Write a protein that binds this ligand. Sequence first.
Ligand code: ATP
Ligand code: KVR
Length: 337
Amino acid sequence: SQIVLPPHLERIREKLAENIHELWVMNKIELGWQYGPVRDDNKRQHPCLVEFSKLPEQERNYNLQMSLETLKTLLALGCHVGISDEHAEDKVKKMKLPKNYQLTSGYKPAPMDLSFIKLTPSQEAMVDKLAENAHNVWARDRIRQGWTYGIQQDVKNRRNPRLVPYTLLDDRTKKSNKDSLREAVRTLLGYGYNLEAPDQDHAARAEVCSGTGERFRIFRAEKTYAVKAGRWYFEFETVTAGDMRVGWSRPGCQPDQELGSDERAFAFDGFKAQRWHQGNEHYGRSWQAGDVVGCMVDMNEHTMMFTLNGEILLDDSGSELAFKDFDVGDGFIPVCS
Ligand SMILES: Nc1ncnc2c1ncn2[C@@H]1O[C@H](COP(=O)(O)OP(=O)(O)OP(=O)(O)O)[C@@H](O)[C@H]1O
Ligand SMILES: COc1ccc2c(c1)CN(Cc1ccc(C(=O)O)cc1)CCS2
């Protein structure tokens, strides 16, 4: 609603609405439909196969309003308005079609040949978001009318399986309406308004939010199994690749504090390839999904070692010791975050 259509976009909008409805009234005929009084699916009949004047005025209103909303959404996402050339837009191309698959109306079959334009993937992704917004509008209309999602289609319960998120949406109807709207956008560019796609947002939020507030869960062995001396080994297999920390923790480790931030835990962050004790320092390489990290501690000379799929991880220098010297204290127990 906040979008104000400039006058050039307005008088282009009128005849692009005309162009789209006539595109539709031969796409139905090439699908094989035929003109008729009532909108019957089995009879293969619709009054809309004819010019907009004799076409039902309510369907004309729908077509014009959806074209206006399409252009308004394109402007609302920030698509740069494109002008090819005034005489290029004044020039109109006609490509004749066979009568059986040609519209009953007198409009030109192909104002623009779908071939001679190489459509840039930037505005192709723009057409993607346009389809997503259009289906959002449709679903909003259904909710306003009171329709709700139901796996089996039922009109009397107003239950529709189509009411689903766009990514989860049915592939067949998805590609159908989606290619209809891609060819509509293709036509509006080919007519002369070669709209320039806006910038692509490379930055991603990466979905760091979690259920509830807690960001990590710490798993550790019992405090009674603390080792005071000797050589010990355990393995940590990363089913997924991501934010994990594994190592040895003191029996006083706090569940709410991240491993290695404090002084009471020694951890290895393979996701950042970084060690953790009273802070973080670069250590080793990163793991992939399915990698196994071996944790080796020798409590006699107070050293810790780490392995990634067998090979011993090493510092920025050639040293293989993850941590050089630490007091035995009250022992260490295996831990993972
Ligand atoms: N060529 C077209 N391209 C896109 N949308 C169109 C086109 N022609 C018509 N429409 C829209 O499709 C709508 C179809 O409405 P229809 O009567 O089929 O469904 P409905 O009344 O919501 O029924 P129900 O959802 O219960 O099946 C029309 O009202 C119009 O807004
Ligand atoms: C996708 O454009 C079209 C193509 C063909 C037809 C219509 C719309 C109009 N229809 C009503 C209709 C419209 C849209 C939907 C929908 O997909 O939500 C369902 C029914 C009657 C049969 S002719």
